[PDB]
Design a protein around this ligand. Structure first.
Ligand SMILES: [Mg+2]
Ligand SMILES: [Mg+2]
Length: 132
RNA sequence: UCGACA
DNA sequence: ATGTCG
């Protein structure tokens, strides 16, 4: 019951909070479709959110109806709400991620999409295909 | 008091 | 260890 015709996203970090990156891959083949340049300070959940929204934009611009898989219960909710409820402090070190998060929410408030955003069931299926 | 997803 | 939700 894995929908193989899908995009899978995941975050990678060093520290949490710490250096965050994310990527999107074809669930079937593992082909890397997008990979964000490391952001110097962010949280896991912020990254997971940015990964989903990147995915939405990526599929929309390509006229693709594929669903997105994420393993992140938090990020799935934040995208549904159009609001990333992060605790991360705001300062000059966290300005970049917070700018990206604000711009992701703005995108969600200005665009439509029909893309199903699905939970990857790790306990049944193993690590998501985009894992680091 | 946890439980869960990372 | 921390970041987050039910
Ligand atoms: Mg993940
Ligand atoms: Mg992972």
């Amino acid at each position: 019951e894995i929908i193989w015709e899908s995009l899978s996203v995941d975050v990678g970090s060093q520290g949490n909070p710490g250096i965050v990156e994310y990527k999107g891959v074809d669930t079937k083949t593992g082909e890397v479709l997008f990979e964000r340049e490391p952001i110097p300070i962010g949280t896991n959940n912020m990254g997971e959110f940015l990964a989903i929204v990147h995915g939405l934009r990526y599929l929309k611009e390509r006229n693709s109806r594929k669903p997105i898989y994420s393993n992140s219960q938090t990020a799935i909710k934040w995208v549904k709400d159009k609001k990333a409820k992060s605790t991360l402090v705001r300062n000059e070190e966290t300005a970049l991620i917070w700018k990206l998060v604000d711009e992701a929410e703005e995108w969600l408030n200005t665009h439509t999409y029909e893309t199903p955003i699905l939970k990857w069931q790790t306990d049944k299926w193993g690590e998501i295909k985009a894992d680091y």
